[PDB]
Chains A and B, each alone.
Chain A
Amino acid sequence: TVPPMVNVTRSITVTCRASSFYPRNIILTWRQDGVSLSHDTQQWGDVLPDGNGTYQTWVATRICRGEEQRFTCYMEHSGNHSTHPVPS
């Protein structure tokens, strides 16, 4: 098992990238105030191999200016989990 590297980027579109993980099974989602967003209000990457024996994926959602502090990206992989804010 290889734990994902999780990185959140703000462009407002916020994107949560999980990279370099194994096995391919992973849960990633945006939350607003801890409440998991529906699948249909997020944009989803495929889970793709990276040529080093691991996988990567991503999930994005569109938010309004000033709402960043309400949004977090939740990850579960291989019995572990984490929560990441939008960087400021």
Chain B
Amino acid sequence: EIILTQSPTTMAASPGEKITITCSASSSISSHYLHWYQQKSGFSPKLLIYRTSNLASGVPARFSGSGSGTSYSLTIGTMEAEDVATYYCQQGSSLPLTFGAGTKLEIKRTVAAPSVFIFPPSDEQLKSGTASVVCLLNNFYPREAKVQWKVDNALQSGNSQESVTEQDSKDSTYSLSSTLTLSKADYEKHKVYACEVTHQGLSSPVTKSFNRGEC
């Protein structure tokens, strides 16, 4: 098959930056059979550019495309917050029809510290024998963060799972959940539940905690 190689794999652009991504075909194709798609996180792909350089319906004028032969590109003339997405090239010159692996474009913004919140397990959940403790890091940038759980001041390992949202289309931040899972028996045997957060927006790590059984 015609292999389409997209570069870069991922890239962060500043707001207002001109950014160009490339699609390299393993052999020559007509520009009339090379198209681009945009897929915003949580949504289906959408047609962005058809026949190399023609903007699809609803696509703003800041997008453009160029190329011929084996070398194609897509340019955003001014990166906007809503342009965070994965961008795919696709060829229809030869069967089978093929897509590139995608280029994920994210946006820089000013450093934003997380707002940190901790949630004890609900009494409803405790009835059925398990305790989930949740630590929320809300609306931060950049994505890199360290979250450490402590129970009675002992560092926890192996008993949490993390999940992170994709970059927000409006404010360009991330949010992160961390869920500590313990048996009800183990949960009732300890008092101090703490999540400690390290992030470059914080001058030192922030700890949020609660004591089980206290107001």
Contacts and interface: CB of A to CB of B under 8 A. Distances in A.
A and B in contact, CB less than 8 Å: yes
A38 B92 contact: no
Contacts of A38: 32, 51
Q: B-side binding surface: helix, strand, loop or mixed?
A: loop
B97 interface: yes
A27 interface: no
Interface in A10-50: 32-33, 35, 37-38, 41
Interface in B84-110: 92, 95, 97
Contacts of A84: none
A62 interface: no
A70 B95 CA distance: 9
A28 to B, nearest CB: 18
B33 interface: yes
Contacts, number: 12
A35 B32 CA distance: 10
B52 to A, nearest CB: 11
B30 to A, nearest CB: 8
Contacts of B32: 37-38, 41
Chain A: number of interface residues, binned into ranges:
under 10
A41 B52 CA distance: 15
Interface string A45-72: 0000000000000000000000000100
Contacts of B95: 33, 70
Contacts of B92: 32-33, 35
Nearest to A41: B32
A56 B32 CA distance: 28
B57 to A, nearest CB: 15
B1 to A, nearest CB: 15
A33 B51 contact: no
Contacts of A32: 33, 92
Nearest to B30: A41
A75 B148 CA distance: 65
Contacts of B51: 38
A85 B131 CA distance: 64
A38 B30 CA distance: 12
Interface of B: 32-33, 51, 92, 95, 97
12 contacts: A32-B33, A32-B92, A33-B92, A33-B95, A33-B97, A35-B33, A35-B92, A37-B32, A38-B32, A38-B51, A41-B32, A70-B95
Given A32-B33, A38-B51, A41-B32, 9 more contacts: A32-B92, A33-B92, A33-B95, A33-B97, A35-B33, A35-B92, A37-B32, A38-B32, A70-B95
Give 6 nearest A-B pairs by CB, closest first: A38-B32, A33-B92, A35-B92, A41-B32, A38-B51, A32-B92
